[PDB]
Amino acid sequence: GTMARNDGQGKAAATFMHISYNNFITEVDNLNKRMGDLRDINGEAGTWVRLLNGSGSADGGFTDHYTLLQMGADRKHELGSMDLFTGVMATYTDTDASADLYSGKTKSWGGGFYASGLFRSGAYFDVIAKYIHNENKYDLNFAGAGKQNFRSHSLYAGAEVGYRYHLTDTTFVEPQAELVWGRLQGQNSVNPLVGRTGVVSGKTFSGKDWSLTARAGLHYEFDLTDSRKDSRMLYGVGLNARFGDNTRLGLEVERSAFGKYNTDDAINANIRYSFLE
């Protein structure tokens, strides 16, 4: 009757929202994860592919897993002591999520543009704007709600800056700060905001025509459903490899602790081909 339906309605609105916010959070990236190392590339154009597979968990019995496949193309402009990459990208995501109240799958596509600036000083920025469309198909385990299909979408803007400080010829530390903001609308209009501050340190090995950089990162991250507060420490290890002049590979694994929502495991990989005209 009315009381059960109102309770149901409340649970459905909370669920729609959790899933919508989850779809946004899942897309939050950073320069190294998407693009790998962009320093000192001898090539005026590039193509890249990035894959991410990972799992998160939170309260309410929440657990999810996602796969992200992204590809992009850019041009490099050398302008004084700045290398500027301007590019475009397409994205796809498949996510499986469940909690005490629901179980289901979201399939998404999106795309956007980015500009990444790498300075001879060691400074860098990365700015991105993208669109993400989500198709959600979920069982609601409550109020005879059954199977529910609904769509959401969002606008995403991100700005990250950072600065590489060499300690020696082959080691560095790189503090970083990022802020991501969005407008999320689904069948709610909320404006999430996620921020991160952190440090990566690195050790580079090399031979005559290859290099391999081992990386360790530790970051503070906070996230707001509406610009409902959560925060966590992220811990990552990675490598970035160069083979000759044209091919790079990046790999990063990550986990978080202390969040209400955590990343329990995630492996990110990307390959970049860079080429002279």
UniProtKB/Swiss-Prot annotation:
- From what superkingdom does this record's organism come? Bacteria
Q: Which residues form the Autotransporter domain?
A: 40-275
Q: Where found, per UniProt?
A: Cell outer membrane
Membrane topology, record value: Multi-pass membrane protein
Record-annotated site: Cleavage: 29-30
Which residues are connected by disulfide bridges in this protein? Answer: none
| Protein name per Swiss-Prot or TrEMBL | Hemoglobin-binding protease hbp translocator
Kindly list the organism's lineage. Bacteria, Pseudomonadati, Pseudomonadota, Gammaproteobacteria, Enterobacterales
Gene name for this UniProt entry: hbp
In terms of the whole protein, what range is present?
1075 to 1377 of 1377
